[PDB]
Every structure is written in C-alpha cells, then in structure tokens.
Amino acid sequence: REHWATRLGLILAMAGNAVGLGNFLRFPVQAAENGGGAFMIPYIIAFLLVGIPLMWIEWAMGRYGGAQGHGTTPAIFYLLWRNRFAKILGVFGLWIPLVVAIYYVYIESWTLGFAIKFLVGLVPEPPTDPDSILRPFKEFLYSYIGVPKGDEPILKPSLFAYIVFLITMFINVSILIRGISKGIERFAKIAMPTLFILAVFLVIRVFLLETPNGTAADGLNFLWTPDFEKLKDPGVWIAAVGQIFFTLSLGVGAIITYASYVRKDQDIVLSGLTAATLNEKAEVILGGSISIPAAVAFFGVANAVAIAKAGAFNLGFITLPAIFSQTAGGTFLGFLWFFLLFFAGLTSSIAIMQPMIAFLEDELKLSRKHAVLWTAAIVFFSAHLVMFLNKSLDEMDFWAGTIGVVFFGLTELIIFFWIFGADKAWEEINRGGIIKVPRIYYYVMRYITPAFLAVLLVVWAREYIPKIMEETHWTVWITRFYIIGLFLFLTFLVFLAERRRNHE
Ligand SMILES: CCCCCCCCO[C@@H]1O[C@H](CO)[C@@H](O)[C@H](O)[C@H]1O
Ligand SMILES: CCCCCCCCO[C@@H]1O[C@H](CO)[C@@H](O)[C@H](O)[C@H]1O
Ligand SMILES: CCCCCCCCO[C@@H]1O[C@H](CO)[C@@H](O)[C@H](O)[C@H]1O
Ligand SMILES: N[C@@H](Cc1c[nH]c2ccccc12)C(=O)O
Ligand SMILES: N[C@@H](Cc1c[nH]c2ccccc12)C(=O)O
Ligand SMILES: N[C@@H](Cc1c[nH]c2ccccc12)C(=O)O
Ligand code: NA
Ligand code: NA
C-alpha cells in the first residue's frame, strides 16, 4: 500500500484538505452574523468538543483500515462492525465525497477562471455609488456562470468557463495520477506555503486600505467587537458547531482515506492536532483579516451588516472584485485573491476525489491510472448537471455536503466508539501516538460529541428539510434522482467488490 513519505508532507496534505474557500469567506461572515468576538465562545467550545474529537476518530479509522488494505468506509465500517448494514452505511461515506466533488471542482474552476481574467486585466471597469460599482461585477459573474435570463431553470456557462473547468479537472488529474507521495504530498508542500504567503500579503495590503467611508481598522473592529447577547440564541451555537464541522472537512470521507496511508503505528494524535491547528490559524487569523475588513473599509461599517447577510459567495466573487477595481493595482490584487482561493480549493478537490480512487484501487484492484481516470470521468460527466441545471449545486451541497456529513459523522462516532468498542477505539486512537490524547477526551468522544452531533442534526433538520422538500422548484427531483442513482451505482460496485473477494 502507498504511504506518506514524510511527516511534514502528511500534515500539510491533511491541512490542505481543511483549508478552503470557507476559511477566507464563510467564517468571517458567520462570525459577524453571530456576535463578532462573542462567536469565539461557541466556536472554540465546539472545536474542543466536536472538531478535535471527531478528527482523531477519522484518523484512527482511516489508519485502522489502511493496515488491512482498505481506505474507504464500506470496507472499514465492515471491519469495525461485521454486518451487511455496515457496508450499506459505508457506501454513504463514499457517496458524499463523490457528490461533493461533482460540484466542488467546478466551483474551484471559477477561481482559476477569475484569477486568469484578473491577471490579464480582462474585468469590468466602473463607473460613484455601491449599486453602480457592484452591478458590473454581479453581471461579470452571472455571464461566466450563465445565470438564467428567462423563467427556465437553465444555466448557460461561457465557453471560457467551460474550458477553464476542463483545465481545472486536468490539473486535479495531473496531481492525483502521480499518487499520494509524488503527487498529493508533493503538491501540498508547495501549495500550503504559497497559500500562507499569499494570505499574509493580502492581510498586509488590506490593513493599508483607506477610504472616505472608513479604514481596515474599522472593519476588524466591527468584526471582532463581541456581542455577548447573541450567545443566548441557540442558532448561534448551531452556526458555530456547523462552522467547525465545515472548516475541518469532517464527515466528508477525505480524512479517512488520507489517514489510510498513514503507517500502522505512525502517530495520528499529534499529526492530526497540528493539521487542525494549521487550519484554524488560516481561518481566524488570516481569513478574518481580509474579506470583511476590506468590505467594511470600503463601504463603511454602515453596510457591514447588509454585506455580511449578502452571503460569503457574493462577498468573494462580487463585492471584493468590485472593491479591487477601486484600489491601486486592485486588478493584480484580485488575481492574488482568486489565486489564493484556487489553491485553497485545489488542495481540497484532490482530497475529495481520492476516496473514490482508493475504492477502485483497494476493492476493484484497478491501477492508479485507471482509477484516477475513471474517477475523473465520472465526476466530469456528472458535473454537467451542476453547470447547466440551476440550483442543482444547491441540492447536492445540501443532501451530501450538508445533511450527509453531519449524519455520517454521528455514524462514525457510534460505530467506532460504541459498536466497535470504546476501549478498543481509544487504544486504536492513542497507539503509536507521539503524544497521548488527554484522558478526558474518552468521555467527550463517548457521550459529549455524539450528543452534540445529534442535537445539531435534529434541532437543525426540523427547521431545514421541510423547506427544501416543499418550497422548491420541481427540478430538484432531477438532482435528487441522479444522486440517488449514484448511491445505487456505488452499492453495485460494492456488491461487485465483495463478490470478487469471494472468488479469490
Ligand atoms: C457528455 C460529456 C461531454 C460534454 C458534452 C458537451 C456539453 C458541453 O457544452 C458546452 O457548454 C459550454 C458552456 O455552456 C458552451 O459554451 C459550449 O459551447 C458547449 O459546447
Ligand atoms: C485558456 C482560456 C482562454 C481560451 C478560451 C477562449 C474561448 C472564449 O472565446 C470566446 O468565444 C466565443 C465563441 O467563439 C466568441 O463569441 C467570443 O468573442 C470569444 O471571446
Ligand atoms: C492569455 C491567456 C488568457 C486569455 C484570456 C481569455 C479569456 C477571455 O474571455 C473573454 O472575456 C471577454 C471580456 O470579459 C468576454 O467578452 C468574452 O466573452 C470572453 O470569452
Ligand atoms: N474544509 C473546507 C470546507 C469543506 C468541507 N467539506 C469539504 C469537502 C470538499 C471540499 C471542501 C470541504 C473549508 O474550510 O472551506
Ligand atoms: N450548505 C452550506 C455549506 C456546508 C457544506 N457542508 C457543511 C457542513 C456544515 C455546515 C455547513 C456546510 C452552505 O450553503 O453554505
Ligand atoms: N509510533 C511512533 C514510531 C513509529 C512506528 N511506526 C512508524 C512509522 C513511521 C514513523 C514513525 C513510526 C511514531 O509515530 O513516531
Ligand atoms: Na477550513
Ligand atoms: Na484546500
């Protein structure tokens, strides 16, 4: 079986998986919509009681399975619990990263697309007023994506947006087809430093920003001013736990597969803890010091609220681009911005596709070349539903990316720490550990963490699913139909995998 060459590589790869567009976009927005500085209370609490606990578990499971030639949950779940229902539940852990990938690479292709357009200075040029500046860029984005102009839920991406998507896929293939060490690990060692560098620069530059409407200091101030009255709101503790789950890429299956290439006795406690720490610093320190400070510096705190409610997407692809077109060398700044995000996405998309690759290699005995190519094929084809059908992206992101990950996280906890055996799991976690997990996490993982994930799934599902299932256009069934098919497909492959094992 393949393995990570170095300890630095492993950590950087794992960290690259967790660091994404969310670090520089979603976090700042959430933190602002949930009490600024006060949001650090439920955020930190969730990181210690959910993020870290679950993270180690996925490392543990991943490594556990890797020692037996299995890097995916259909087999790993079976190993932790020899029951056919464990194989079916394991399929769900392979379905999620596949579906997510189907829409994520495309999203990533956007950043590469914009980075290019900005680099070469092919962008809108206002003109005065905010609406006047924003509209040109709002339309710049809409033209790229192909936002519907009619009542038909049809998207029509630009030829350029399509071609860039092909290139993005090609870049992912190039890295993946070289394997774990010479491909993923190798690229991580370059991407992370480049990422960190680009972030730092952007941080410095933003702090210099001064307009009649305000400064970067105003933005940071607003963002970090604690509103201790919002902590009462349960919806805040839900946004916090959700933000941690998101930023750590938990329940997505990526971590398990990466961890399956960790040697039988190679530490996962310190390695995992460090990987997480890296992501956190990139999120709060860097991510919180760019987008929002910039938006507030340019539009004044008078719109800090509105802009925050406008969403992370608008913030990263519309508002900031517009801000850049009004600052000195802003166009080359936009480049660095989207360049930053592209590497943020890339280090995740390669991780989000490895699971499907690992399955083909481990269970169907496909060469790495064939596995990667077929995986690229499946995702590339499937992506066309996301590119051309409006709101398909949202549907996949919901069931798989959102619902799926929280449900699966709870499943992991229970199978590992309850079915498999708490003590067995605990030793399975601490074994080979450079450092040992504080004896207190035993109870956290066994009761506290599952309890949390349950409340999150439940309290949140009550005020979520009803909408999607009722207040949506009928075309959502196209997407639901397709992704359900993918689940069937994967269930079939698993069937074929277990039949092959019996034959040999
Ligand atoms: C089925 C797998 C192969 C892809 C089938 C071709 C569909 C892609 O269609 C492409 O869409 C782009 C974006 O709207 C357009 O700009 C291009 O003109 C068009 O060729
Ligand atoms: C590598 C990324 C740049 C290459 C992609 C360029 C393709 C988009 O090029 C576009 O093609 C359209 C259809 O022919 C024309 O109508 C547009 O004028 C032209 O800009
Ligand atoms: C030099 C390598 C990169 C070439 C950049 C090609 C991408 C340009 O893309 C072009 O942008 C124009 C203005 O936004 C649009 O009007 C065209 O429809 C679009 O194809
Ligand atoms: N970790 C990503 C979010 C994320 C969660 N699961 C994923 C799966 C694939 C890609 C990204 C993700 C971020 O910080 O923004
Ligand atoms: N669905 C969320 C993003 C997301 C994906 N997976 C998640 C897990 C937890 C919280 C949020 C997410 C959004 O619309 O932005
Ligand atoms: N468990 C120790 C020693 C060890 C066992 N197997 C390893 C494989 C690689 C590196 C170290 C090890 C560690 O992770 O450091
Ligand atoms: Na992150
Ligand atoms: Na990444």
| CA 251 to ligand 5: nearest atom | 8
Q: Are the C-beta atoms of residues 426 and 442 closer than 8 Å to each other?
A: yes
Closest listed residue to residue 141, CA positions, set 310, 309, 314, 384: 314
Q: Are the C-beta atoms of residues 351 and 19 closer than 8 Å to each other?
A: no
Compute the distance between CA of residue 392 and CA of residue 383 in angstroms, rounded to an integer: 10
Resolution for the entry shown, Å? 2.6
Sign of CA dihedral 123, 124, 130, 135: negative
Element (H, E) at 296: helix 291-299
Place of tokens 């996280």: 409
Closest listed residue to residue 451, CA positions, set 241, 276, 253, 248: 241
Distance of CA 107 to the CA centre of its chain: 11
Distance, first Cα to last Cα, the chain: 19
The type of residue at 415 is I
Compute the distance between CA of residue 383 and CA of residue 376 in angstroms, rounded to an integer: 10
Compute the distance between CA of residue 2 and CA of residue 66 in angstroms, rounded to an integer: 9
Q: Hey, what are 443's tokens?
A: 């109870």
Distance of CA 44 to the CA centre of its chain: 19
Residues with Cβ < 8 Å from 310, sequence gap 6 or more? 319
The residue whose CA is least distant from atom 11 of ligand 4 is 348
Distance 322 CA to ligand 1 centre (A): 29
Q: Are the C-beta atoms of residues 109 and 103 closer than 8 Å to each other?
A: no
| DSSP count for the chain of H helices, then E strands | 27, 2
Ligand nearest to the CA of 120: 3
Distance 405 CA to ligand 7 centre (A): 15
Q: Are the C-beta atoms of residues 445 and 53 closer than 8 Å to each other?
A: yes
Q: Are the C-beta atoms of residues 119 and 335 closer than 8 Å to each other?
A: yes
Neighbours of ion ligand 8 (CB under 5 A): 16, 19-20, 344, 347-348
